Subunit: 709 residues, 2 copies
């Protein structure tokens, strides 16, 4: 009565041996049921063999509350209150890879507590246009910044045994017509802008799940695209994970079988007909009819089983926790380093230790940012509002509030029975008798702002915020603007206000992270992950007239042309000599930093083992202590093809004390100087003079040298 | 430095002391009561996982809504429906009971459930109790010997058992307002032995208090049985959870030893161990020591279950789990009558007629807490047609009882019987499959039976089929004994119970002959209702108090419950306790006693031996039952009591020797004057036979 342990249930055997044995014991019906969903966020697994279910959870910034089995409606559970972490556009603004791993590790522990197999995150779609409503959960517009910040995120989550989901593996750069948009982008712009983030997340980040987007590429949906899923991801990058479809992205059985769709979810309105999925009975009837064999099926099952063995089949996974002191400290520490100090004229910030009589104006000062937005919705255990955070730090009796404007509306009765002009009248009337005016405005998570399935109508702030800020700055020159947005906003009032900060959507500890910066308890160290355009025409996608695309005559497909090519974001404004309000990598601090000349004659092409060392002295020459993101840019003098004026190829964040001096050394390999030749279809470095630019921003270059390769 | 409560290399109690020192008073209050219908919140901050209770001593209940009894609509909770616990006890096989629990625990680990609300071992003192089907008969020794392996099987997977209804919940009428008045002798000899064995030997991690009252105290917070008996005398270290709705007092729930509260009527902040408890602690009326004891036990339950990692992952609807339910059913079916060896049917048996609603009616869905979404349930008609395909099996409805299953039949009760007897004339055999169901008034949890007779007029249907054909066979699906006025008219009678998923397949294995019936009756099948001691003395429902709403039931039959009553009164039931035929025969040799022996102990038992031989042509299993009788006792004692049994399989012609080690627990009684278990010196008659009345060998012995 003592049989030997079955190979797929034997922990002492290698993982690939157990997957092979489990595959041989599954029936064809069990193999097909494994590759598609049984509920809204779950797959059945193999209940007969003991292979557990895979439970997908939403939120790259937190754990979505439990929903009903089939509907999007909340299940009504009282144990799914999570810790809302700052948005990925804020995490990327930290430029701190060490925090990105602590961000992911804290999120993975919360996913383990909720018994969730895969976290639907992170998203690393390049911010092609400032109107994309989903850019708030991405990592900016630079392919190098997003790449070096997605790898620690994936390492953190997967360290707890929970898989990460590379969201929208595609060209999903705008939400308008996202289900019928066919992107026509050049191969050069594909390999240098939109792919580097996803490649470093696969080959280096070792992500176990890669999600395809709703859009199309080369007349094929990305949830079953032969060019990017098979030829690029699984073959070229040697990807051994699962390609999960976005909830609704699958549309063809024949393509889902042969183009590499391993796991199907949310297939269509309603999605409760799980037998009618494109990888369910239509796949089963086609195998029974002899149209397909079991090769593509066994490959999809071998990958989904590999995802199951990396997660639910494990035993040494941490149980995790939720709403713990450590998880709140991580979200607090990320927000303190995510806030970007844009403007600080006459050193008005930080506020002095005797800051009495302060006026707070704006809806975002009292409006929650964790609930709403569709997939980004989160039931936070508690959300510290900017007004409440500034009250606990400066005293409740020393802080007063005026509504200012009304936008839209967790049980918060944000209604205000005052007209828009009357709200402005008594708000500027209190600004005349106020020492400081802290304006907390920006966007929100409603349709058309920082929300999925929709895009912005323009760059200007909605609800007429341009007039309210200009009136507050006219009645009080000490007006401080706190902008909550995942996209850049127009600022026709930057010369009238004293201080401007990009505070993003920080989540739970939002008010406490803003108060730490306003008071001076935390030195601002965030750098912008995109270009803050002064107008919408400064964006290359809108300057060349190619943002929504063109609908086909006898079809419902939209053909959009990425005519800006590799010149996206700061690569466009540097070539066109345009001057934005604040450029990529911009970030001020409460203490000036000093740069030295590069230590570093004529050397050959560097490699990964033998890199080109570049040293730079960094010194703190102020009175306060803070962090500084030392950015490194590389420029090619005479390239064969068109290249931007500079490209970010290295960066490092270092904490310094007042009077401290350190020597930062960078190892530059062939990736810092190479470019993708679309003819030969390969990367190649061309010999010549290269200029190494190092400074506090993409335009605040402090030291520049030259070297020939 | 890993925190001590998260370090697996430390003893469990040291991890509990460290976890307790890190919890706040609010976290301690939230831990000991529920947050949903079947879950407690645990300690979300410290990482202490939640505890998920699940219904089903025979399976895993489908998922319900967070704060509702309605089904949640999940499509992954289809489980294996194992036979009722009254069928498992009918096997008398301790090995099957452990495999029964091992398979159920694996399905509990699959659904990610911490505690299985089971097993229930409430003594069936009356044939009218609604939920006797999920209990283990009327004898305390049979229940105590079948509950321990069941608990070993479930808790081997890291899923705790819930010893259901630690009380005297022997009937469901007025179950919430019933105060049981029972003597100490009947309490110690009948109603408590099954629970003590499950606690001391089975090592159950959770004990559930019932809805009724004892000494004017609800058993979910009873100082006499939860504190004095359970936690003190028996040294119980587990959790005393409450039945869903059994807690009714805040003061008693704190002092009388209630560890986990669930289903309190109202929301969750208003539980008797919630805000009323948190306010009384802050006001200074209650201390935190009694609170820490509750947290100490709930954490001990969590550290034995969800806190571990080495537990098996489990599975659902596997070949092993179906094979276990198949084996339990084959050995649970009790062959009552088999006149002229009509069974088993020949290999070329054809022209078979099946009659009855229970032949096409599912027995796994319905019944409230016993409801299950079985992935498959082989109906008796499906099992008999799979064994005899083509046109070898015909079917007629016969009768209608109640009712995704379309059980509609637009025919009068006279027309249904007329069509059944017309087909019974032109049939070689008549396989009637009747009994009860899971509706209210039969084998249901919130009601009792109206009587002992078969409902829906099945007596007139069985008599009409037996008259039209002498080869009529009756299959009774019930958890309680049924009246049989047609006993002398039917060729073969089988007690097949509720077998669950592999129900129809187990019946076909017995009817066709692919398996030898080895089941024995776990209760006394009374011929009439007044043959039960609880009903003869007129003390089944109790007496309604004048002012209060509490009912007072007085156990007047005392220890004489079940076969202990019909033996003293010399009554003749239809089939006695431990009755069960077989397709083969068994012969018993002379009982071998040692050469005025002293009172045995656990280290020096009284060894008895009896030769057993299969004197037939077919292989089969026999349940050899040992009974002890005291000729001249001090207090009243029954004519014989079950004290040992062993189930042995014998090939045709094979003879073995069965040696039983009888210690002091086979000859002792409980005297209410001394409040102890004492052994009286004198002559004891050791009786061994195939039933409680089919004594094949006997021998007297004197103890000193």
């Amino acid at each position: 009565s003592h049989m030997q342990t079955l190979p797929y249930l034997d922990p002492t055997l290698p993982i690939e041996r157990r997957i092979d044995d489990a595959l041989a014991r599954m029936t064809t019906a069990e193999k097909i049921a494994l590759i598609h969903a049984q509920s809204k966020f779950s797959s059945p697994g193999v209940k007969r063999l003991g292979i557990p279910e895979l439970w997908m959870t939403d939120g790259p910034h937190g754990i979505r509350p439990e929903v009903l089995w089939d509907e999007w409606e909340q299940a009504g559970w009282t144990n799914d209150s999570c810790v809302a972490f700052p948005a990925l556009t804020a995490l990327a603004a930290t430029w701190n890879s060490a925090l990105s791993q602590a961000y992911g590790k804290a999120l993975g522990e919360e996913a383990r507590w909720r018994n969730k197999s895969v976290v639907l995150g992170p998203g690393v779609n390049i911010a092609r246009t400032p109107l994309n409503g989903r850019n708030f959960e991405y990592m900016g517009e630079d392919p190098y910044l997003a790449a070096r910040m997605v790898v620690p995120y994936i390492y953190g989550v997967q360290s707890n045994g929970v898989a990460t989901s590379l969201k929208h593996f595609a060209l999903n750069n705008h939400e308008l017509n996202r289900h019928t948009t066919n992107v026509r982008v050049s191969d050069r712009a594909l390999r240098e802008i939109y792919l580097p983030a996803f490649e470093a997340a696969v080959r280096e980040g070792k992500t176990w799940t890669v999600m395809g987007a709703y859009n199309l590429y080369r007349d094929q949906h990305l949830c079953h695209n032969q060019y990017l899923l098979n030829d690029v991801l699984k073959r070229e990058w040697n990807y051994d994970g699962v390609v999960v479809s976005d909830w609704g992205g699958t549309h063809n059985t024949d393509e889902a079988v042969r183009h590499g769709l391993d796991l199907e979810f949310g297939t269509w309105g309603a999605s409760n007909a799980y037998d009618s999925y494109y990888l369910a009975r239509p796949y089963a009837d086609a195998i029974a009819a002899g149209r397909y064999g079991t090769d593509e099926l066994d490959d999809k099952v071998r990958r989904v089983l590999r995802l199951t063995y990396r997660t639910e089949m494990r035993t040494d996974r941490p149980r995790g926790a939720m709403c713990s002191e450590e998880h709140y400290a991580v979200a607090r520490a990320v927000g303190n380093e995510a806030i970007v100090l844009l403007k600080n004229d006459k050193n008005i910030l930080p506020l002095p230790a005797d800051a009495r009589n302060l006026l707070v104006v704006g809806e975002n000062a009292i409006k929650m940012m964790t609930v709403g937005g569709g997939s980004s919705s989160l039931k936070a255990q508690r959300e510290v509002l900017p007004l409440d955070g500034l009250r606990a730090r400066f005293g409740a009796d020393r802080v007063r509030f005026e509504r200012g404007y009304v936008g839209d509306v967790t049980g918060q009765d944000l209604r205000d029975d005052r007209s828009p002009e009357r709200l402005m009248a008594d708000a500027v009337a209190a600004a005349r008798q106020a020492d400081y005016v802290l304006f907390v405005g920006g966007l929100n998570k409603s349709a058309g702002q920082d929300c999925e399935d929709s895009d912005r109508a323009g760059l200007a702030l909605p609800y007429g915020q341009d007039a309210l800020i200009a009136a507050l700055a006219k009645a009080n020159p000490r007006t401080i603007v706190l902008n909550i947005s995942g996209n850049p906003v127009a600022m026709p009032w930057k010369n009238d206000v004293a201080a401007i900060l990009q505070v993003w959507m920080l989540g739970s500890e939002a008010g406490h992270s803003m108060a730490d910066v306003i008071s001076g308890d935390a030195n601002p160290s965030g750098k912008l992950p995109f270009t803050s355009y002064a107008a919408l025409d400064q964006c290359g996608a809108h300057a060349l007239g190619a943002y929504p695309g063109q609908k086909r005559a006898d079809s419902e497909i939209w053909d959009v042309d990425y005519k800006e090519d590799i010149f996206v974001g700061y690569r466009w404004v540097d070539r066109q000599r345009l001057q934005p309000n604040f450029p990529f990598g911009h970030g001020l601090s409460y203490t000036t930093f000093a740069y030295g000349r590069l230590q570093l004659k004529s050397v050959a092409v560097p490699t990964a083992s033998a890199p080109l060392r570049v040293s730079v002295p960094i010194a703190n020459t102020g009175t306060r202590a803070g962090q500084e993101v030392v950015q490194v840019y590389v420029r090619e003098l005479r390239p064969k093809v068109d290249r931007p004026e500079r490209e970010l190829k290295a960066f490092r964040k270092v904490m310094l004390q007042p009077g401290e001096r350190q020597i930062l050394t960078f190892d530059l390999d062939e990736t810092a100087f190479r470019y993708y030749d679309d003819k030969q279809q390969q990367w190649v470095v061309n010999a010549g003079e290269f200029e190494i630019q190092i400074g506090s921003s993409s335009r605040d270059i402090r030291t520049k040298a030259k070297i020939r390769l």
